[PDB]
Every structure is written in structure tokens, then in C-alpha cells.
Amino acid sequence: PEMVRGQVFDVGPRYTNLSYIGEGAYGMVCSAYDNVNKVRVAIKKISPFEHQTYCQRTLREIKILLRFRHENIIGINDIIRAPTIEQMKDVYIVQDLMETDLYKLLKTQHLSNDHICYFLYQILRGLKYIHSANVLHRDLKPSNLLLNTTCDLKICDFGLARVADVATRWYRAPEIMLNSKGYTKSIDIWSVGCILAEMLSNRPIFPGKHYLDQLNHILGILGSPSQEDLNCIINLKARNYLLSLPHKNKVPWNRLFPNADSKALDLLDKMLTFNPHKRIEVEQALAHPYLEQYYDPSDEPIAEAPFKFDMELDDLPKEKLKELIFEETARFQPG
Ligand SMILES: COc1cc(O)c2c(c1)/C=C/C[C@H](O)[C@H](O)C(=O)/C=C\C[C@H](C)OC2=O
């Protein structure tokens, strides 16, 4: 029983020597030496069960990750749990041990004009898969962007995944907190775009303290939304809500990211489009001139086959979910 700061971590004897590398109200992330593979690793503990949405995602990121396989996605190496359901009050997913994440790097480092480019390639490259897979990450953000020794990048966390058809804050598309309930591929582009700007400026472009403040920060640069040839962004109480909202001029991109690559900005523009319906797609984004020396179609794998299981949103009550999580996490259970 190795207790790291907070609480316990029943992972040994395969995973001993613990430390700590990341926080989070839903689970503590520790690094630990694995006596079987002879290399340290990342062990994420999760204590869901109290509530459902929680166990709903717990057994969903598992489903995703266990069935995915991309170099720009950090997979599940193995899972540790108790031997009896009635005794299972926490799951530990073992993952690779990355060097650092994109939120920390920008917190100090100054990505070169190329480094920015290479990272952004990798991101979209992994994105051009979770999508081929027809799955929305919904929560892209620096923190969920792992990095290791040889500058490898990995997208982390898939609890909000959920097929195409509480959280981050600054990289959520406008409509998420506005129009149709997210659910759509463009939600991620917007997020990947928001990360792009931060690598250019090492500071979040739309750091609005709260929804409202958020929308303002945004309108701050894109200036008042259009009311010409609209479609799924119109609105009623909102539009007039703008009747209280003066009009703001779009701030060209040169005036924010002045010393930024002419193309890096063009791409940042196709991504930060208010209307999701006129927001550049993932494949068309890699294509884009900026991401040139990297765009390699015969080296950018796409999901094996789409999803659409049976558990979705609502329905299955914890008890029912717990068993599944349990039986699902059985093949990893020794013996
Ligand atoms: C040394 O610094 C680190 C090296 C790593 O390899 C990880 C982390 C930190 C942890 C960061 C926590 C997250 O950013 C956030 O909660 C998340 O992304 C969820 C999955 C996290 C996964 C277990 O994390 C790592 O492997």
C-alpha cells in the first residue's frame, strides 16, 4: 500500500516507487517504476463510482483507447483494479510516461517557428483519426497534449470523447456554449486552433473568465458575428442580446501575431471561424501550405472502423456500468 500525498495507490508489486506528475479532482496521476517492463510509467487513478456521468466516461475512455492505436494518442498499457466488484472503489489506468505537456512547455519555452509547426502537425495528425474513427475528443487543450524526449506529441484524455453524430474552458467552440450541443467535428478544430495561437503567443487567445466574458473575448478579435448568409448561428433573444452588445470590428491577425509566419496565420484563420459550417476540416487542414514538409497522407493512418455501440448518453445506471467497467477491465486483471 503506497500512499502518494493524497491517498492510496494499490498498484504494486508491478508498479512501485511513486511520485506525482499531475492533479485533477477526478484522479491523481503518478509516475511509477514497472518491475516487469523495467521502465517508469504513468499511472492515472480514477475514483468515479460516487456519480454516474463519471463512471459513464470512466468506461468510455477505456472503450476508445483500448480500440485505438495512433502515435499521437497515448494508449492504455494496462489497468489495475480490485478482484471483487463489491471491493472495486477505484480504477488505475497505466499509460506511457511522457516527458512533459503542451501547457507546461508554453509556460516557459518559446516554440521556434518550426517547433510550433511540427507540434501542430502531430496534433491534427492524431485528430485526423479520432475523426476518421468518427469520434469527437471534445476536450483538446494544452494539458491534454503530451510530449516526450524526441519531441513526440500525444493527445490525452478521452472521457468526453463520445462518437460524432465542467471541462477545459478556453478552447471550446463558440456554439458549444451557444448553438447546437457541440456534438460535431468542428468543435475540435476550434480547440486545435486555440492551441495554435498560444504557441504563437504563449498565451491563450480567448481566456474569458466565464461564458459571457468568453464570448466577449472572442468577439474581441472576430468582431460581431454575421447576419448575412447565416445558417445555424442566427438566433433570436441572442441577436437582440447583441442589441445591448455594441458592434466590434474584426481585428486582423497581423496585429496580434505580428512576427508570425504568413501561412501559420492563414491556417489559424480557417480554424478560428465562428460559423462551424465554414470552418476548415481536419484533412483539408494538414493539406494546407503551412503544414507542408509534414503533410504525409501515406503515413497518416485513419481509424480502422467507425463506432456506435450501445451505452451512449443516459440510460445505463452506475451498477450496470460498474459491472461492465469491471468485466471490461478483466482481461488486464492477472490470473
Ligand atoms: C511529467 O509530466 C507528466 C507526464 C505524463 O506522462 C503525464 C502527465 C504528466 C499527466 C498530466 C495530466 C493531464 O494533463 C490531464 O489530467 C491528462 O492529460 C489526463 C491523462 C493524463 C496521463 C495519465 O498523463 C501522463 O502520462
DSSP 5-44: SSSEETTTTTEEEE---B--TT--EEEEEETTTTEEEEEE
As annotated, the residues of the chain forming the CATH 1.10.510.10 domain(s) are 98-316
178 alpha carbon – ligand 1 mean position (Å): 30
Would you say 46 and 18 are in contact if contact means Cβ atoms under 8 Å apart? no
Which residue's CA is minimally distant from atom 6 of ligand 1? 98
Angle value at C-alpha 257, between 292 and 267, nearest 5 degrees: 30
Q: Which contacts qualify for 226-232: CB closer than 8 Å, 24 or more apart?
A: 226/274, 226/275, 230/275, 231/275, 231/277, 232/175, 232/179, 232/180, 232/275, 232/276, 232/277
Strand-by-strand arrangement of the 39-46 sheet: 15-18, 29-34, 39-46, 91-95, 76-80
279 touches ligand 1 (CB under 6 Å): no
Q: Shortest CA distance to 131 belongs to which of 73, 177, 193, 178? A: 73
What type of residue sits at position 80? I
Would you say 186 and 276 are in contact if contact means Cβ atoms under 8 Å apart? yes
3-state class (DSSP) for residue 271: helix
- C-alpha cell recorded at residue 55: 463512471
Residues in a beta bridge with 78: 94
Quote the CA–CA distance of 15 and 13 in Å, as a whole number: 5
CA atoms 165, 170, 173, 179: torsion sign: positive
What resolution does the deposited structure have, in angstroms? Answer: 3.0
Task: Out of 101, 102, 152, give the residue to mutate to test ligand 1, the one with the largest number of ligand atoms within 8 Å of its CB.
Answer: 101
Which ranges of the chain would DSSP assign to H, the alpha helix? 52-67, 102-105, 113-130, 186-201, 211-222, 237-241, 262-271, 282-287, 318-328
146 touches ligand 1 (CB under 6 Å): yes
Number of residues in the chain:
335
Distances (CA, A) of 56 to 31, 43, 166, 313: 25, 20, 15, 8
Q: Among the atoms of ligand 1, which is closest to the Cα of residue 103?
A: 14
Task: Out of 15, 18, 19, 21, give the residue to mutate to test ligand 1, the one with the largest number of ligand atoms within 8 Å of its CB.
Answer: 21
Would you say 70 and 156 are in contact if contact means Cβ atoms under 8 Å apart? no
Estimate the share of the chain in helix, then strand, then coil, as percent rounded to the nearest 5: 35, 15, 55
Collect all residues with Cβ–Cβ distance below 8 Å to 10 and sequence separation of at least 6: 1, 80, 82, 90, 92
18 phi, psi to nearest 5 deg: -110, 160
22 alpha carbon – ligand 1 mean position (Å): 6
143 touches ligand 1 (CB under 6 Å): yes
Q: Among the atoms of ligand 1, which is closest to the Cα of residue 156?
A: 18
Task: Out of 19, 23, 29, 74, give the residue to mutate to test ligand 1, the one with the largest number of ligand atoms within 8 Å of its CB.
Answer: 29
Q: Shortest CA distance to 245 belongs to which of 219, 221, 222, 226? A: 219
On whether 126 is known to bind a ligand per the annotation, the reply is no
Q: Shortest CA distance to 95 belongs to which of 81, 83, 82, 79? A: 79
Method used to obtain the model = X-ray
49 phi, psi to nearest 5 deg: -5, -40
Residues of 246-281 as b/e, b for ≥16 C-beta within 10 angstroms? eeeeeeebeebbeebbeebbebbebbbbbbbeebbe
237 alpha carbon – ligand 1 mean position (Å): 41
2 alpha carbon – ligand 1 mean position (Å): 20
Q: How many CB atoms lie within 10 A of CB 232?
A: 12
Rg over alpha carbons for the chain, rounded to the nearest Å, is: 21
Angle value at C-alpha 193, between 279 and 54, nearest 5 degrees: 100
Fold of the domain built from segment(s) 1-97+317-334: Phosphorylase Kinase; domain 1 (3.30.200)
Would you say 37 and 28 are in contact if contact means Cβ atoms under 8 Å apart? no
77 alpha carbon – ligand 1 mean position (Å): 14
Collect all residues with Cβ–Cβ distance below 8 Å to 253 and sequence separation of at least 6: 260, 265, 268, 269
168 touches ligand 1 (CB under 6 Å): no
3-state class (DSSP) for residue 126: helix
- Parallel/antiparallel/unpaired status of strands 76-80 and 39-46: unpaired
CA atoms 220, 223, 227, 231: torsion sign: negative
144 touches ligand 1 (CB under 6 Å): yes
Would you say 54 and 60 are in contact if contact means Cβ atoms under 8 Å apart? no
Residues in a beta bridge with 92: 45, 80
Q: Which CATH class is domain 98-316?
A: mainly alpha
Which residue's CA is minimally distant from atom 14 of ligand 1? 143
Would you say 15 and 34 are in contact if contact means Cβ atoms under 8 Å apart? yes
Which residue's CA is minimally distant from atom 5 of ligand 1? 98
96 alpha carbon – ligand 1 mean position (Å): 9
Positions marked active-site: 139
CA atoms 313, 319, 324, 325: torsion sign: positive
What type of residue sits at position 180? S
Distances (CA, A) of 206 to 44, 99, 114, 267, 289: 29, 27, 23, 17, 25
